[PDB]
Symmetry: C4
Subunit: 361 residues, 4 copies
Amino acid sequence: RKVEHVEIAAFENVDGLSSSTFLNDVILVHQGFPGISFSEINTKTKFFRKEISVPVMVTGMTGGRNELGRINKIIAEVAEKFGIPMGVGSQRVAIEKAEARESFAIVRKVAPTIPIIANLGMPQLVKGYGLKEFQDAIQMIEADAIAVHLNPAQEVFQPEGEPEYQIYALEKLRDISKELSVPIIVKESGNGISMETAKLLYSYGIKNFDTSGQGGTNWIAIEMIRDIRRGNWKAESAKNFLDWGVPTAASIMEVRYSVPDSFLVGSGGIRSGLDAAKAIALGADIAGMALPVLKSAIEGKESLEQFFRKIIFELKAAMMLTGSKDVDALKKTSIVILGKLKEWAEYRGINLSIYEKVRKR
Amino acid sequence: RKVEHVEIAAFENVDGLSSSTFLNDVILVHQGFPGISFSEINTKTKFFRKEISVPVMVTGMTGGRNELGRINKIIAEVAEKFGIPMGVGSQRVAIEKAEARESFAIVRKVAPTIPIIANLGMPQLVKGYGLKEFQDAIQMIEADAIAVHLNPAQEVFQPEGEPEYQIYALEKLRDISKELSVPIIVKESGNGISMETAKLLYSYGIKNFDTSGQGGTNWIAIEMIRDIRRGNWKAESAKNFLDWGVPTAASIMEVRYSVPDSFLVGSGGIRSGLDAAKAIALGADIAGMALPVLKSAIEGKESLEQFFRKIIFELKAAMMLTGSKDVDALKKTSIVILGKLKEWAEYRGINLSIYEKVRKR
Amino acid sequence: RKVEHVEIAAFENVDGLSSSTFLNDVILVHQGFPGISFSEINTKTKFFRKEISVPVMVTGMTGGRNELGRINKIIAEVAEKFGIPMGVGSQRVAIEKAEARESFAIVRKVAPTIPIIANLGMPQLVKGYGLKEFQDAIQMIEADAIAVHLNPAQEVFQPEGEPEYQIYALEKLRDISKELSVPIIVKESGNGISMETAKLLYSYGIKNFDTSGQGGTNWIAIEMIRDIRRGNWKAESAKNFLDWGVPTAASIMEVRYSVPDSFLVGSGGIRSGLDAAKAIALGADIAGMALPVLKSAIEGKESLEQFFRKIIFELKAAMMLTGSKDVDALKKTSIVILGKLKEWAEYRGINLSIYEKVRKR
Amino acid sequence: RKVEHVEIAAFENVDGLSSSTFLNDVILVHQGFPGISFSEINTKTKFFRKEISVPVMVTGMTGGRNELGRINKIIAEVAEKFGIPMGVGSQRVAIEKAEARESFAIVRKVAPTIPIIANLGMPQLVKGYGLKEFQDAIQMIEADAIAVHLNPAQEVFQPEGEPEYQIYALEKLRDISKELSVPIIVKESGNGISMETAKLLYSYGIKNFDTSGQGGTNWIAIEMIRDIRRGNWKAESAKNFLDWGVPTAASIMEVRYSVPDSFLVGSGGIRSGLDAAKAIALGADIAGMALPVLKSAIEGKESLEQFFRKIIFELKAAMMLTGSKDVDALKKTSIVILGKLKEWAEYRGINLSIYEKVRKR
Ligand SMILES: Cc1cc2c(cc1C)N(C[C@H](O)[C@H](O)[C@H](O)COP(=O)(O)O)c1[nH]c(=O)[nH]c(=O)c1N2
Ligand SMILES: Cc1cc2c(cc1C)N(C[C@H](O)[C@H](O)[C@H](O)COP(=O)(O)O)c1[nH]c(=O)[nH]c(=O)c1N2
Ligand SMILES: Cc1cc2c(cc1C)N(C[C@H](O)[C@H](O)[C@H](O)COP(=O)(O)O)c1[nH]c(=O)[nH]c(=O)c1N2
Ligand SMILES: Cc1cc2c(cc1C)N(C[C@H](O)[C@H](O)[C@H](O)COP(=O)(O)O)c1[nH]c(=O)[nH]c(=O)c1N2
């Protein structure tokens, strides 16, 4: 299943299927006189208590079997080489089975210095996970943070089970955050974070968000494919929901606007360093990527190293061409917002002038 | 003719031909933390004095011959099983001919508990139909309401006759509503209800509306096909009017805005539980369907049962993914309106902020 | 030349080539309760001192040779039969040559009652045409009005000569209008009348306008074809100007807004009774057509009679479906303006609310 | 390299590749009564201390080798014949190597009267070019002005080196402008001038700007091709930046708005006299062209003479059809701005009403 998800994501057509990030509606303003030289560009930024080399992270994907651990090992060793944070996939299977632990632990063996982010699902909190399970997920990889994932859309359309997101999960999460020695990030899984969800999470003490908006890996498409494969009836219902979700660009605006002091990962269809530059200029603190890192990792270590070189060059290209000497300058560089993203923001009450102010701090 | 209409609708290409519901311009905001579990979602709602299981109805289509009665029987027995209200097609032929009565009456034999809605055409009121004919339509199926249909566009382009909609029809309707023991719904037939028509109807005491907007079954197209078939000249005129009408989404807004306390069926191209959810979030109380139910019913009882299962699942998926525990929560869930629907509303003086208040209260 | 124009217009691809009327941006609001019956719809309207049967006119095209006279004869006898006003083409050639007179005069022989509109070009007034030439054009067909045509775009791109539009032409026109016993209409020839041109003309006493906007017969395209045919260099310059001009729908708004008491023909790409209905609802008093009437007339009398039957039926269909009992009701019926037409009006300072008032008063 | 650039630009598909000038969003309002005759249209304008025949210039491209000098010769002799100013390509190579001088000097031999504009790169000013190098570039062709070019986008993606744009380059430019006897123009190279860049340049004494926006020659695409040719990794990064830059139309508005008294060349994808007319009406003083002149020059002298005849005719056609008797009238002619250009301006704080005033006062 963990294998089926990786196989469908890697080898089927589910990246941006019938969906959109709205990042085509964001334009970074070109500066013919940048005021800087390329070699002075500094891409360093903070990630909680650590310093990272590039404002980019690999968000959680996998682990739980030996083949999955070996993808994890490739990603972690390259992320370590580049000074990039790495999230692991859901650790539930390793909480339940001790054999599954090594496919996660290998990450910290091979990547001793970079931030490592643990992973459990929100529904677990209503299915009897609490402090201990969180502490075990964290300890298992000596995590610097834990991501708690929201995936209700995926769960609605998958052949098995049904989503459970009672508010008790948040009361529980809020208690756990009291006893935990590392921060919690709340992340979506391809369908995005709205302002109602961001505000609700914030009222429970959540300050760190990962948008994971639509336009990237389409998890409803992935479950549609799983349903097709088993002749399950839900397949054609999933098809009607292929464009369901908040587009990544809209989600970045919604979280930055509604929680101005959040620490924000902009992810969900980040595929180039230009996407990453746009996500940051729009209001993210860092850009997150999952699928393209998986596909590269599967090809090999050297393929993944080339991938990160390309992303970093493209990010720096966008910084050079906007006169942004550092990540901070990029966060306040000039942009244009047009088209559907503009209409979305307007309808949603995002005053574009107070937005400009909020994103530039 | 009643057969010709069924055959063209079922088997020719007239569903959304050159027309649009504007429902693509409506987005339901995804909630990554729904605040509920799937199993607590409650789809029950009121339909006049009865409780229905799902905020969906089958709107009037057919009856008047044995083969038509057997489609009615299938739809009625499945609607009964699902707790879904059902309208019958125009009852004129059974007012005139006693042989035609059974093809309507069968509906109540097979569906004893659900709301059943009778049907006569508005032009009949200027052609000498009154209280007695309405009472007979109602009594024939022990109806819980009567739909009075507007189809002037269909009548303009059909080979035979000409439309007649003098206001005397409404004075008469208003008198009838005084003596009748069930409510009157006024419905269109594929071309939509505007705010001028809604307000006029309302000034005569009409409080129940069924939008039946363009973007679904194209009745102008159906008449175009009948015209082509008989070498009638009007065919190419009908072709020019294929996109005539108020789109379903715009018609929902117009009626909810201009008559805030209306009981409102949003129909005309509702083809999925997602369309149904959108129509309800926009301001409808319930969503209506006709064509897709016909096509399923023609395939058989089990085909139609699977159809309703799919609609209901898709509806609940939208409720789940929006954090709507019940139909009432759905009616006030967050939306985005973009594109042509937005421009339509603006031009039509629909202040989007007072609209939000009206559709949510 | 007069024949080459007819031949290119009738048989080449120049109708709406790379151009647009903007009439797709105008929607007539459907009224599902019209409040009228089809048979009470009255299409009569005033045309100066005469009453016409339909708010439609055939605008000027041809005359000057026997074959051209025989097209004129067909158009005139059918327009007479339908109670429709008819303009003739430029009469210059018959002012110059007595042989050319009959191909214009035939129109009045065969159409003794309808309004007939004479035709001369604005540039003629700067090439020494005056009162007498106007009187002779008028007397030659016992005209009820004279159209003075603007065609600078055609003249710029045609193989021969160059346009001349000095204001002296207007001083002269203004003097002529003093001595003339019939009104002057100023018309364009495919490229439309702006507010600056309308206000200038109005300051010289012109109150009757015919928009002749882009989207219909593309005269720049016709001249491009003439250029291609003779290996003239201007062909590829004409190609760059194919979409030059004010779209018909924008031109109707611009003239109605800037001269609220104008008598206005909305023409340029009117191809159905729906186009005609839209043009009138937008602000025109009557709709004009040229090319489709030519093409039909060339096929024959019976073909042209069917053409007008179709136009008239489509017009009345739009009146029915909008609850318009007469032309006046149509002029104030509810519309929606979207898309590029809306952007054009906004940029051009056409306040949509003062526009509504002006088109309806 | 200088030849590789010419060969790719001339013979590969890089003109407007995945980019747009936004000039489709600018409409000149047609005037059916122009108020002028074609033969009185006056295209003369000022270019610093000289008078030019047409408000058009050939912007800098080439020089430095014999084959390049012979293209320069053709352009220069034709520009001289038409009274059109001409810029030369970067003179760096001729500052370094005396053999390279003649391929620039030939321009002044063959074009003794027209304005000739020298050329050096902004990065040279941080690599130790100063007063003397500027004087030598100017003296070598008896230049009437010197252009300093911004090409950071091209430099980012080219196989070799890295862009350097420290502000020291501007302090140095400011000093040089004090000792130079001819004006400095700052120009981009296909990616456009923003308001931040224009204002910064202005604060250092720059008053003359050449937009060189995206939508014309795509220099990122040219470097992409150079990269593909050498199997360089940056090719696929360049591909992601193909649409990077300020569109020419947006750049004209940004410079005119932020520096209302600037002398402004509108260039980047000017391909017809209609484009040139639109650029000028929008806010440019003159329109600039490079690529289409190169392509014509390569075909031959007579081909380039035909090219200029066509541009001039198209320009005058736009002036005739807007009632613009001279260049000054064109600068204040009526326009419509729509679509993405309108959204760009609005987002960028370009108040359209104060814009109207600035572009025509
Ligand atoms: C194969 C694979 C498997 C997983 C995912 C991704 C993929 C591709 N993602 C979601 C991921 O972190 C991310 O939010 C989305 O994929 C959107 O980003 P991309 O469009 O993939 O860059 C994910 N999320 C998480 O929180 N827990 C998990 O275990 C998984 N598993
Ligand atoms: C074959 C058939 C026949 C009928 C219709 C429909 C179809 C498909 N409809 C109109 C129907 O109730 C509905 O308003 C429209 O068809 C729009 O909804 P759908 O797009 O079909 O869901 C209709 N309406 C009604 O009030 N009286 C009737 O007799 C009929 N007849
Ligand atoms: C063959 C032919 C010849 C002429 C024309 C048209 C055609 C098709 N038109 C212009 C005509 O009256 C009308 O304004 C435009 O053609 C736009 O209307 P349509 O799009 O053709 O309906 C025209 N106008 C006019 O004032 N004097 C003329 O002599 C002619 N000649
Ligand atoms: C082959 C060639 C070579 C050069 C260029 C152009 C081309 C086509 N351009 C840029 C040019 O002046 C202009 O700003 C852009 O090309 C945009 O205009 P067009 O879209 O080409 O009209 C250019 N500009 C400059 O300032 N110095 C230079 O040496 C060059 N070299």
